[PDB]
Scaffold this active site. Structure first.
Site, PDB file in Angstrom:
ATOM      1  N   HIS A  41     -23.166  -9.785  -3.249  1.00 43.55           N
ATOM      2  CA  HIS A  41     -24.214  -9.880  -4.254  1.00 43.55           C
ATOM      3  C   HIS A  41     -24.489 -11.304  -4.692  1.00 43.55           C
ATOM      4  CE1 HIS A  41     -21.482 -10.465  -7.739  1.00 43.55           C
ATOM      5  NE2 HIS A  41     -20.745  -9.478  -7.266  1.00 43.55           N
ATOM      6  N   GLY A 143     -18.595 -14.883 -13.736  1.00 49.61           N
ATOM      7  CA  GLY A 143     -18.218 -15.952 -12.840  1.00 49.61           C
ATOM      8  C   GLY A 143     -16.923 -15.724 -12.096  1.00 49.61           C
ATOM      9  N   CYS A 145     -16.331 -13.143 -10.093  1.00 50.52           N
ATOM     10  CA  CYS A 145     -16.499 -12.399  -8.847  1.00 50.52           C
ATOM     11  C   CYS A 145     -16.040 -13.250  -7.680  1.00 50.52           C
ATOM     12  CB  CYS A 145     -17.949 -11.989  -8.654  1.00 50.52           C
ATOM     13  SG  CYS A 145     -18.491 -10.886  -9.933  1.00 50.52           S
TER      14      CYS A 145
END
Ligand SMILES: CCCOc1cc(Cl)cc(-c2cc(-c3c[nH]c(=O)[nH]c3=O)cn(-c3cccnc3)c2=O)c1
Lengths: 301, 303
Positions: A41, A143, A145
């Protein structure tokens, strides 16, 4: 003596963390050899969040759209491919700090160390267990991920988790390093909720064995139970079923302590009935279920 | 979201851990620049341990008596000296993995990361608080002596703890890296006990703030108090006195929350008598006191 949630030393993984940026989206990537792994993503935008077509989004990207930074070095992306929910960016230099490693998909109940990272820079390390409902109870901010979970039995890093999202109840969902989500979750912003969670019974038993190893016996009793009767009672407290597999796995700890597995099961039944009555076990006032049998043996002897 | 006990990433320290052997005794050393630091009791035999004469044991020893192993590489010792309860072994090679570092001595109630090591090899990392009674509640087995505790500030490692002993109660005692013990302990194999412990009040309050930041609010109430009234109940329950400096440190969390410290102390005041008996805050059935205010801010801001 002592018993703590003990993470693996994180150095081998710290040297693999990088920052990946697409447009306004920045998250973490894992740089192993000449590939950077990150959540796909990273290529979404705002209006892409509910129903992104990742195949169509990726086809429109050129290599120079991906900004990958390892410390101050910019890594040149020379190719890319999507595997399930993970993006694999081929880069023009192999990571000289790449450890011996493998990818493994873990089962619910297993534990691993999480190296929480922001902007490619590690911030903390802690233990997590894969819950029966395929979430983990971590500590993650925006942040984070692309942060990964791993074990390092021997000197080989086993990567088992990449962080993708936080669910509405505040728990966390992610994939293995092949990009397959744990649980029924999908990487888009549609309404999703974790199922009802349950307690990992084999882990509670392992932790009670740890308590005995460390010198505490106050919770034992003179009773035993059948495996069937134990499961009938424990499920009334939302505990996971205990299988014969679990009974076999606890054999070594039973052998070391002299307490038959089904005798420890009887202790657990009584603890669920009574509570702790002002006492603690290994410093806790609740029954702990995020230590596996393997974790107990790793730490106690 | 979420709140977890988190250690600092340990990579900068892993590259400093070595094995130090003296006869039958093997334990861990910290290799920084061209010096290896380890507990001075590495120079004792089992019979020496009972009543050691360290300056005489050290006089009897020579550079060749110390075997220092960094991975599979043997380091040559070219000098040796004692500083308080720490042995300093000069080696012929500066550690190329030496991080920016300094030695600090931490205060009770402050936290740090422990890198538990065996045979010079890092094994696990976890967070510890220095207790009011100057012990830490770690997890250590035989062979762990010389494991270290540390904090990281940007790129600078602040080393604060070196592990020396386990007390009869199973808690742990050690020194700063200048060899000064935390607590009223001596490095001799003898009967020793830590004082009665107390609860770190400012940390319990910090953790209650963390609980609010995370949606746990059932303990809030309309009431307030003052230090004198609270400190009086704190005394009754073996809690540390709450000072004005503590209230100042929790300032940020009081603002970003709308709960005044003495409002929260009123919350904590209430919990201390009535209590838990099962119910939970941040998934705990007891009042946690090993999170500092900065641990809470640091973690709930992404540093
Ligand atoms: C089921 C409802 C949640 O749906 C989704 C779905 C998807 Cl595909 C992603 C996300 C998500 C994205 C990001 C993120 C976006 N943009 C960036 O630049 N950096 C990021 O890190 C961060 N966090 C997050 C926040 C806090 C803790 N952990 C993860 C997320 O959960 C949520």
């Amino acid at each position: 003596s002592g018993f703590r949630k003990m993470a693996f030393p994180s150095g081998k993984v710290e040297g693999c963390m990088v920052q990946v940026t697409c447009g306004t989206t920045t998250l973490n990537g894992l740089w192993l050899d000449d590939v950077v792994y990150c959540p796909r993503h990273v290529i979404c935008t705002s209006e892409d969040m509910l129903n992104p077509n990742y195949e169509d989004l990726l086809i429109r990207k050129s290599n120079h759209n991906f900004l990958v930074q390892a410390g101050n070095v910019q890594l040149r992306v020379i190719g890319h491919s999507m595997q399930n929910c993970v993006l694999k960016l081929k880069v023009d230099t192999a990571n000289p700090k790449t450890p011996k490693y493998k990818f493994v998909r873990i089962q619910p109940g297993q534990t691993f160390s999480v190296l929480a990272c922001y902007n490619g820079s590690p911030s903390g390390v802690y233990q997590c267990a894969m819950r029966p409902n395929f979430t983990i109870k971590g500590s993650f901010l925006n942040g984070s991920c692309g942060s990964v979970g791993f074990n390092i039995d021997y000197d080989c890093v086993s990567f088992c988790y990449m962080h993708h999202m936080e669910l509405p109840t505040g728990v966390h969902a992610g994939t293995d390093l092949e990009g397959n989500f744990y649980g029924p979750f999908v990487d888009r912003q549609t309404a999703q909720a974790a199922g009802t969670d349950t307690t990992i019974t084999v882990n509670v038993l392992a932790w009670l064995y740890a308590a005995v190893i460390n010198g505490d016996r106050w919770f034992l009793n003179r009773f035993t139970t059948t495996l069937n009767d134990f499961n009938l009672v424990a499920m009334k407290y939302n505990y996971e079923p205990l299988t014969q597999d679990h009974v076999d796995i606890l054999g070594p700890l039973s052998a070391q302590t002299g307490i038959a597995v089904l005798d420890m099961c009887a202790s657990l039944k009584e603890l669920l009935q009574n509570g702790m009555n002002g006492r603690t076990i290994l410093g806790s006032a609740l029954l702990e279920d995020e230590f596996t049998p393997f974790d107990v043996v790793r730490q106690c002897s």
